[PDB]
Amino acid sequence: VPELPEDYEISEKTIITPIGVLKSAFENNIIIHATRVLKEGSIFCLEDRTLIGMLTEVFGPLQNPFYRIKLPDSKKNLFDELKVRLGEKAFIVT
Amino acid sequence: ELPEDYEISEKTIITPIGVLKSAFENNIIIHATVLKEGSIFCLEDRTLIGMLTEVFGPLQNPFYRIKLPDSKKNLFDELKVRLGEKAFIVT
Numbered sequence: 001v002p003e004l005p006e007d008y009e010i011s012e013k014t015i016i017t018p019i020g021v022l023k024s025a026f027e028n029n030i031i032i033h034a035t036r037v038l039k040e041g042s043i044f045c046l047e048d049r050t051l052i053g054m055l056t057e058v059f060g061p062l063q064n065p066f067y068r069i070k071l072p073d074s075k076k077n078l079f080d081e082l083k084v085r086l087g088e089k090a091f092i093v094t
Numbered sequence: 095e096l097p098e099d100y101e102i103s104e105k106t107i108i109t110p111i112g113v114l115k116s117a118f119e120n121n122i123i124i125h126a127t128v129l130k131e132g133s134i135f136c137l138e139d140r141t142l143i144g145m146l147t148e149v150f151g152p153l154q155n156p157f158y159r160i161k162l163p164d165s166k167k168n169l170f171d172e173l174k175v176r177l178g179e180k181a182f183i184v185t
Contacts (some may be wrong), residue, residue: 023118026125026177033119059150059159068150086118 002041002054003072010049010093019044019092020067022052025083028073029056032090034065043093044069052082052090095145095163102140102184111135111183112158114143117174120167121147124158124181134184135160143173143181 010016017036024031030052032044044052044067053069060066071079102108114137116123122143124135135143135158144160151157158181162170 024116024123026115026123031116031118057150059148 001056004043004051004053006074008051010043010045010051012049015094016045016047016049016091017094018089020090022046022082022086022088022090023066025079025086028071028076028079030069030071030079030082032067032069034060034067036092037094038092044090045093046085046088047091050081050085051078053078096134096142100142102134102136102142104140107185108136108138108140108182109185110180112181114173114177114179114181115157116177117170120162120164120170122160122162122170122173124160126151126156126158129158129183135181136184137176137179138182141172141176142169144169 019036020032020034023033042055053071055067056070057068058065112124112126115125133146144162146158147161148159149156150159
């Protein structure tokens with residue numbers, strides 16, 4: 001599985017592409033509801049380039065998938081921050 | 095798809111199955127701690143969650159997704175508020 005350093009920040013230049021809506025946060029999982037050309041290892045972020053993390057699992061029906069991003073323990077602070085931002089548009093870095 | 099008048103009768107065997115962890119977009123997510131296709135989930139007071147719609151997650155610690163229909167919005171809102179409670183499987 002793949003993991004993201006802490007000082008990794010999405011540069012303000014890079015292209016960001018809308019992908020879905022942050023819908024859920026439990027147990028260090030972040031759930032995004034699909035709304036868009038995705039990879040293994042694609043990185044999700046919010047519009048302000050707050051980095052969410054890397055795709056862990058795709059589930060739900062093919063038409064409107066749900067994406068699950070599992071954060072590691074070291075990323076608890078980030079989890080709590082996202083927990084509180086449910087409903088914001090999520091994006092996939094390219 | 096369950097009828098309206100359907101409630102779990104207090105007489106029926108219930109079985110712990112996981113913990114209610116999440117509710118969004120009419121889905122209820124349960125974290126596992128036998129199950130059949132078409133098994134009914136409920137809480138310990140027999141409050142009906144609904145019928146299994148999807149098994150995902152890793153094989154060791156699955157998650158269960160129950161999609162409720164629009165007509166059961168009131169029940170979603172009630173379950174939304176009850177996160178963390180033990181879930182059970184009817185038998």
